[PDB]
């Protein structure tokens, strides 16, 4: 047999496949085969026929497709152009299925930042130059809705940078009603916010400057308003603005999420800039004045005494069939996140689930069923299991449908449902070979294996993989979870060097049962190193005390947990105490820099890639959610005492590598610039590397270059 090579990892050689059906009905779904033909699939009859041929797509170089619910018009998307992590612009054509030619008479402007159908019928809503346009049919001129849209100043229907990256994680801010009656959009105002300007070089004689509205910690925030308009007669009274609750409307506040319940009912969630209070409001529609009213008896408050509300984001409620009560997961009395059922007041919440374990996410709620994720199985906090609960039945019930289907192979599941929950799909990511299956939906009996990955298994018969285990440490009433990767033919009578991979970000988890063939596998399989990941306090999915122990104090407990784990590993017996290294990425860079300069002498070399130097250089939302205001009255003391530049004198007897991208928009180059300047002023030697015109992800050949350089550094360190 042979071991893994670096070229197997740099270029895609062992990469699995996933099958996510593009559900259009409760019994049918579309797919794109390996022929550029868009094919419809029905389950009851089983017949599949091509609904869009490859010649039509090749005519316009179409790369994406979108089908109207009435199945009379399709839109083809080409000229893809990425903007941020989630946003992009593309050119759209419209093709008529009944007649067989492209619709003519009124073309769409290009480029378009976002486009969408309506749930019922075929009427189009799109965004062109920060304004929202509505078309009743693809053969009629558009009806403009908004006029104040301006580049980088006013945004309509799409979020700005902060909400796209920190709040919504989406590229859209417009919502259609369930029956396609109204349209709810959001106006973002960024006029007083300071801008960040960096240089982009490109293939030109003069480099240009990119300016982005970016609120740092303690700066001015965007101003958001929410409008709801009617689509049938959109000029009778015009857009109407939903009232803001008085309790929220006393200082700066954020907009969390919007969700439609019925045709005359909306739900909006609000957060104060002090992020330990959240408010849920339900707004109803009055026909006598064509208005939206948000009463006070329909106000729900959620406050966290020991920390921020929720985790990384705020839980989005799921509404029942009667549209009068809902479900939401939050912390219980003992400090464990669980499901609660709200009907009238937040004081009458009902604990449907209770236990030491946690609930991660909720997928579907129906008239007599409810689906969610949990770690309850065998006290392993790295496994995702999908469960099923019964609602409104004479006997109570609860069943785990993904527990013993494939035990030694699959312990990680993601569910994708259809209309009326008649059918759904399960995707398994690890720890065995990833699989994709489709289930009945009522008896939950497997029907058709959508993806098995036989080619990967056949190709992995002559490669010996490193062995992976997950175990637990108990130190000073603190439970740490560590995953260890060991080379093949491992004996405990010898000594091997050790590498630690750390992220440690708040509300995160790096110890999960997932399948991946990556750089770590190459290092363990060929170079004979032992790799480890450790999770301690400050991470998620284990409890409330563990999660909130890091509140208002970032950069203290993670380093202690890493050092404790390293010392226990050395005490285990098979680790060379003269060869230990650590590395991380974008929060693991911060932790790696703090741990390398802790003065304990445990580590020999360290690598930091795109780290955060100071917490005053990052976005307001994320920074202030876990730290607080940088004012002399609240938390200015810890801001100045938790910077990497304050440890510059402790890098003198270690090896350090610093890597960052020039055109990064998420973590700016100024962090690495300040780190380098601090190390220069302290007369400390280090190594550096930059990548020109590269974003946070370092896509392309930059990834190959980065991994080769890091491999050389690690080989020289442990020689």
């Amino acid at each position, epitope marked *: 047999m042979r071991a893994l090579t670096l070229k197997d990892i740099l270029n895609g050689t062992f990469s699995y496949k996933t099958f996510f059906p593009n559900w259009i009905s409760g019994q049918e779904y579309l797919h794109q085969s390996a022929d550029n033909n868009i094919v419809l699939y029905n389950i009851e009859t089983g017949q599949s026929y091509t609904i869009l041929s490859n010649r039509t797509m090749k005519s316009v170089n179409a790369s994406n497709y979108g089908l109207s619910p009435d199945r009379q018009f399709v839109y083809l998307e080409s000229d893809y152009s990425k903007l941020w992590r989630y946003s992009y612009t593309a050119t759209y054509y419209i093709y008529d299925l009944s007649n067989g030619e492209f619709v003519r008479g009124n073309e769409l402007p290009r480029p378009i930042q976002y486009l969408c159908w309506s749930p019922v019928g075929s009427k189009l809503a799109y965004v062109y130059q920060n304004n929202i346009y509505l078309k009743q049919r693809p053969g009629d001129p558009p009806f403009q809705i908004t006029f104040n849209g301006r580049e980088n100043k006013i945004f309509n229907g799409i979020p700005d940078w902060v909400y796209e990256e920190e709040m919504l994680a989406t590229k859209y801010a417009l919502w259609w009603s369930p029956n396609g009656k109204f349209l709810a959009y959001a106006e973002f105002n960024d006029t007083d916010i300071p801008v960040i300007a960096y240089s982009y070089y490109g293939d030109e004689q003069y480099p240009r400057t990119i300016n982005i509205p970016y609120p740092k910690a303690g700066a001015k925030n965007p101003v958001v308003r929410i409008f709801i308009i009617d689509t049938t*007669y*959109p000029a*009778y009274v015009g857009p109407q603005e939903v009232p803001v609750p008085a309790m929220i409307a006393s200082s700066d506040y954020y907009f969390s999420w919007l969700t439609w319940v019925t045709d005359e009912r909306v739900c909006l969630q609000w957060l104060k800039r002090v992020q330990n209070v959240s408010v849920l409001s339900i707004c109803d529609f009055r*026909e*006598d*004045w*064509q208005t939206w009213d948000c009463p006070k008896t329909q106000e729900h408050i959620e406050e966290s005494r020991t920390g921020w509300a929720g985790g990384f984001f705020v839980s989005t409620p799921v509404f029942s069939y009667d549209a009068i009560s809902y479900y939401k997961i939050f912390s219980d009395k003992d400090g464990y996140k669980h499901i609660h059922y709200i009907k009238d007041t937040v004081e009458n919440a009902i604990q449907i689930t209770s236990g030491k374990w946690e609930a991660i996410n909720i997928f579907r709620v129906t008239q007599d069923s409810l689906f969610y994720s949990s770690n309850e199985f065998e006290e392993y906090p790295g496994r995702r299991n999908i469960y099923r609960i019964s609602i409104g039945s004479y006997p109570p019930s609860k069943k785990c449908v993904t527990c013993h289907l494939r035990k030694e192979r699959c312990q990680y599941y993601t569910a994708s449902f259809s209309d009326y929950a008649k059918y759904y799909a399960l995707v398994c990511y690890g720890p065995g070979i990833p699989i994709s299956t489709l289930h009945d939906g009522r008896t939950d009996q497997e029907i058709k294996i959508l993806e098995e990955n036989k080619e990967l298994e056949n190709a992995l018969k002559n490669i010996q993989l490193p062995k992976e285990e997950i175990k637990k440490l108990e130190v000073d009433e603190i439970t740490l979870w560590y995953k260890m990767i060991l080379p093949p033919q491992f004996d405990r009578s010898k000594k091997y060097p050790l590498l630690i991979q750390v992220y440690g970000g708040p509300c995160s988890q790096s110890v999960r049962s997932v399948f991946a063939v990556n750089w770590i596998s190459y290092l363990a399989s060929k170079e004979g190193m032992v790799i480890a990941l450790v999770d301690g306090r400050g991470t998620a999915f284990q409890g409330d005390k563990l999660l909130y122990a890091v509140y208002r104090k970032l950069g203290v407990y993670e380093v202690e947990d890493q050092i404790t784990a390293v010392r226990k590993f050395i005490e285990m017996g098979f680790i060379d105490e003269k060869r230990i290294a650590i590395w991380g990425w974008s929060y693991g860079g911060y932790v790696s820099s703090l741990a390398l300069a802790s003065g304990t002498g445990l580590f020999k070399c360290g690598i930091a890639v795109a780290p955060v130097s100071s917490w005053e250089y990052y976005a307001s939302v994320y920074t202030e959610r876990f730290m607080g205001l940088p004012t002399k009255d609240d938390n200015l003391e810890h801001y100045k005492n938790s910077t990497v530049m304050a440890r510059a004198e402790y890098f003198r007897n270690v090896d350090y590598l610093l890597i960052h991208g020039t055109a990064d928009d998420n973590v700016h180059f100024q962090n690495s610039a300040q780190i380098a300047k601090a190390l220069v002023n302290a007369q400390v030697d280090f190594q550096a590397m930059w990548y020109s015109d590269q974003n946070h992800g370092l896509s392309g050949l930059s990834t190959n270059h980065l991994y080769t350089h890091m491999t050389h550094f690690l080989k020289q360190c442990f020689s």
Partner: nanobody, 122 residues
């Protein structure tokens, strides 16, 4: 139900006019009333509203402080007085009857008549 409107016509800029509307069939003096307009090629745009009792009246943001409304239940008539005209009000006007007499209410798409054309130009 029958509604018939009259008045208006061609007018020079800076002028002033008044239009009248009369309805039959249903029971008057018990429902609120409103005035709507339809520009050529555009959609219906609500202009003003008046209470059943005649006390409180509401005017749109485009006709604020220039338009006045009145009603007389004795003769069952509605008057709209449009002063300080500008070359953007060329449209056909209609009177609309609401379905709520307990208070003011803007009718959405209830009873309709024929409408009266008004054009302002130099």
């Amino acid at each position: 139900v029958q509604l018939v409107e009259s008045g208006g016509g061609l007018v020079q800029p800076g002028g002033s006019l008044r239009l009248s509307c009369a309805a039959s069939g249903f029971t008057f003096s018990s429902y609120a009333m409103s005035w709507v307009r339809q520009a050529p090629g555009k959609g219906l745009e609500w202009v003003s509203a008046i209470n059943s009792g005649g006390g409180s009246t509401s005017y749109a943001d485009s006709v604020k402080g220039r338009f006045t409304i009145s009603r007389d239940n004795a003769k069952n008539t509605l008057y709209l007085q449009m002063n300080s005209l500008k070359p953007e009000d060329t449209a056909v006007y209609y009177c609309a009857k609401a379905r709520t007499g307990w208070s003011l209410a803007v009718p959405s798409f209830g009873s309709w008549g024929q409408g009266t054309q008004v054009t302002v130009s130099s």
